[PDB]
Amino acid sequence: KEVCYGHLGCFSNDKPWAGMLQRPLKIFPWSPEDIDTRFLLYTNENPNNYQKISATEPDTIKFSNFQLDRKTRFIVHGFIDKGEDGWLLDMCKKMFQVEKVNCICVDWRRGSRTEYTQASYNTRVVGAEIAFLVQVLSTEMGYSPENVHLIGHSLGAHVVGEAGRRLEGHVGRITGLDPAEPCFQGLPEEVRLDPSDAMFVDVIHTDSAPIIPYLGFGMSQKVGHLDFFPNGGKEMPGCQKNILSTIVDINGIWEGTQNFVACNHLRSYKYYASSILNPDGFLGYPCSSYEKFQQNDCFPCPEEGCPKMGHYADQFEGKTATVEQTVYLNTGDSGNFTRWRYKVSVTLSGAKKLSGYILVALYGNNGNSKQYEIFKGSLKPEARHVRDIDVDINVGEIQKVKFLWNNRPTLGASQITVQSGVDGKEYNFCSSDTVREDVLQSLYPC
Numbered sequence: 303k304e305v306c307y308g309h310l311g312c313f314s315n316d317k318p319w320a321g322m323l324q325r326p327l328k329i330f331p332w333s334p335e336d337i338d339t340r341f342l343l344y345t346n347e348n349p350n351n352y353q354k355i356s357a358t359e360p361d362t363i364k365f366s367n368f369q370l371d372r373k374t375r376f377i378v379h380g381f382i383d384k385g386e387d388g389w390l391l392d393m394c395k396k397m398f399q400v401e402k403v404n405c406i407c408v409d410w411r412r413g414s415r416t417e418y419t420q421a422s423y424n425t426r427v428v429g430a431e432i433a434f435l436v437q438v439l440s441t442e443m444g445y446s447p448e449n450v451h452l453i454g455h456s457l458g459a460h461v462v463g464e465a466g467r468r469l470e471g472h473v474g475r476i477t478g479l480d481p482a483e484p485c486f487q488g489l490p491e492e493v494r495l496d497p498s499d500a501m502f503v504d505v506i507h508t509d510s511a512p513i514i515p516y517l518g519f520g521m522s523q524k525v526g527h528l529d530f531f532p533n534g535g536k537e538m539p540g541c542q543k544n545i546l547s548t549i550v551d552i553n554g555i556w557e558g559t560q561n562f563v564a565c566n567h568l569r570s571y572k573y574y575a576s577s578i579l580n581p582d583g584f585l586g587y588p589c590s591s592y593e594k595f596q597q598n599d600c601f602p603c604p605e606e607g608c609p610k611m612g613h614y615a616d617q618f619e620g621k622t623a624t625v626e627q628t629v630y631l632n633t634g635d636s637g638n639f640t641r642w643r644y645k646v647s648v649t650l651s652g653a654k655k656l657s658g659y660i661l662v663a664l665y666g667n668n669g670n671s672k673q674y675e676i677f678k679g680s681l682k683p684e685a686r687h688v689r690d691i692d693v694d695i696n697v698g699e700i701q702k703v704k705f706l707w708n709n710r711p712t713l714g715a716s717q718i719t720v721q722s723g724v725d726g727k728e729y730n731f732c733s734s735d736t737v738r739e740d741v742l743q744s745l746y747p748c
């Protein structure tokens with residue numbers, strides 16, 4: 303059957319829209335009136351107070367500060383944790399710091415603040431609302447959908463995915479921030495976010511552990527041209543893991559009646575926010591798997607460069623070469639979350655075989671790093687060891703490195719190579735010395 307809502311078309315309840323394993327209930331999405339989608343426009347000139355725009359009343363747009371010669375980015379919410387109500391506008395403000403943009407925050411709280419399955423179905427109508435506004439801008443004002451970027455978090459990722467399908471995949475870009483798993487993962491492409499929804503789709507996965515039994519609200523399934531899995535995509539540094547327990551009560555979670563640490567689910571947008579100002583701190587390395595990446599493979603950046611996770615992912619050369627490209631990287635646990643990966647190779651030197659740990663610190667014109675463990679076990683002179691480390695600072699031009707070992711024997715590194723990921727640049731350092739344990743050995747350019 304289907305309910306029709308005027309200019310937003312009809313909404314069917316048969317397969318695959320409803321009556322499926324992931325969504326058995328055959329109810330219909332609420333009316334546009336009951337969802338009350340609100341398009342709140344903010345621009346560099348009006349960053350504090352919004353200008354409500356309506357596709358059905360074109361004058362709201364004509365009289366607004368919407369600039370036809372600027373890109374447009376829609377930001378759509380989903381799960382809203384206590385105190386995070388203002389994350390959409392916060393995101394717009396960060397964008398304002400680096401670009402001129404029409405930032406439209408999509409508020410559909412009346413439609414989302416209800417039982418989960420209902421909210422999930424309501425995404426269809428919010429998606430139709432977005433598609434219609436984009437269609438008005440395009441057909442009536444000559445503003446191409448190519449200038450439009452739809453950012454959707456949680457349930458909002460499927461809202462934007464629906465908008466894209468309606469636009470026949472012509473919207474410029476869609477960014478899915480930890481797309482909601484319950485009621486979407488495993489279903490046909492027509493009912494969820496997928497690569498065909500936009501000319502370019504990038505996804506950040508941050509809470510991809512199964513909702514049952516792990517309480518991971520995000521999708522593990524790949525749904526973009528680029529699918530980023532920072533820190534593995536299931537557990538983020540700095541976030542308390544959720545207690546492994548009985549079905550969820552996916553609705554109790556959604557509606558705040560059940561305990562749930564939303565930290566991992568929200569990290570997706572937290573990383574996006576930071577990537578706006580610090581994209582160089584989020585270089586992503588395409589790789590067949592996270593374990594492979596963690597085993598020091600898929601480094602340095604490939605010939606096409608590394609896609610920068612977040613805001614600047616659209617700059618990636620191979621962004622649409624294929625779909626479901628897995629991209630990995632690790633982040634910090636707080637603040638900017640930025641990291642700079644370096645492949646460190648150490649060739650040991652000395653007269654005695656020892657047992658212990660070897661560490662290396664990097665020194666550059668931008669500053670120096672802390673010491674990082676490269677290897678632990680038997681330390682044999684002339685043996686070479688390699689480890690890719692995620693440093694919390696960009697040292698810039700590496701001018702020297704320091705070697706340190708621990709558990710009056712002496713040990714040293716005759717040569718250490720440090721390769722930066724961005725361009726594969728190898729810096730070599732050399733020394734003919736050896737030091738006692740817990741003493742820093744400096745190695746200079748060679």
Ligand SMILES: *[C@@H]1O[C@H](CO)[C@@H](O)[C@H](O)[C@H]1NC(C)=O
Nearest residue numbers: 576578579580637638640695
């Ligand atoms: C964090 O990012 C901001 C904005 O780009 C920058 O000004 C600040 O220096 C960064 N802090 C660190 C520790 O990198």
